[PDB]
Ligand SMILES: *[C@@H]1O[C@H](CO)[C@@H](O[C@@H]2O[C@H](CO)[C@@H](O)[C@H](O)[C@H]2NC(C)=O)[C@H](O)[C@H]1NC(C)=O
Ligand SMILES: *[C@@H]1O[C@H](CO)[C@@H](O)[C@H](O)[C@H]1NC(C)=O
């Protein structure tokens with residue numbers, strides 16, 4: 001996560017807010033209005049990378065490179 | 073209409089090979105000897121509940137059964153899974 005007050009402030013009212021990884025579409029609807037004047041008040045961008053360490057085939061891997069295989 | 077499920081609906085719980093072993097696991101399974109509901113093409117595909125999950129089957133040779141539909145309300149007001157099995161391929 002990182003500060004985004006340079007991009008996500010003007011104000012910017014698009015940021016409506018309200019089980020693990022639940023999504024949802026009186027009611028609890030509330031929104032921001034970010035202005036560059038806002039410091040904890042400022043917009044921050046976040047990416048949460050969640051890693052599926054299941055036993056299935058691997059499909060995202062780091063920048064590592066293979067050797068030849070060696071046996072016995 | 074109903075009939076006995078016997079043993080049906082056992083599936084590989086995880087993608088790990090194991091052999092000659094009695095592995096014990098907690099998961100969603102069709103209970104042994106439980107009643108299945110049974111249905112026919114003679115004027116029979118209403119919206120069933122799905123509950124925790126569905127075992128399904130058909131006995132076939134005509135291949136007139138060609139897909140499945142799922143969701144909460146099935147009416148564009150949510151995204152709805154369609155599975156098809158047409159000609160040779162599963163298509164989703
Ligand atoms: C998943 O779907 C179920 C219904 O298919 C949702 O639970 C129902 O929610 C409605 C209002 O949205 C209520 O009137 C019902 O009383 C609820 N039923 C039950 C059994 O609780 C559920 O909230 C949905 N969840 C998500 C994340 O979409
Ligand atoms: C199973 O179906 C039979 C009729 O075919 C019925 O008598 C019995 O009560 C049913 N049992 C359950 C658990 O549904």
Ligand SMILES: *[C@@H]1O[C@H](CO)[C@@H](O)[C@H](O)[C@H]1NC(C)=O
Pocket residue numbers: 156158159160161163
């Ligand atoms: C099945 O239907 C899809 C479109 O839903 C089509 O692209 C495809 O040619 C059909 N046949 C097979 C073998 O998938």
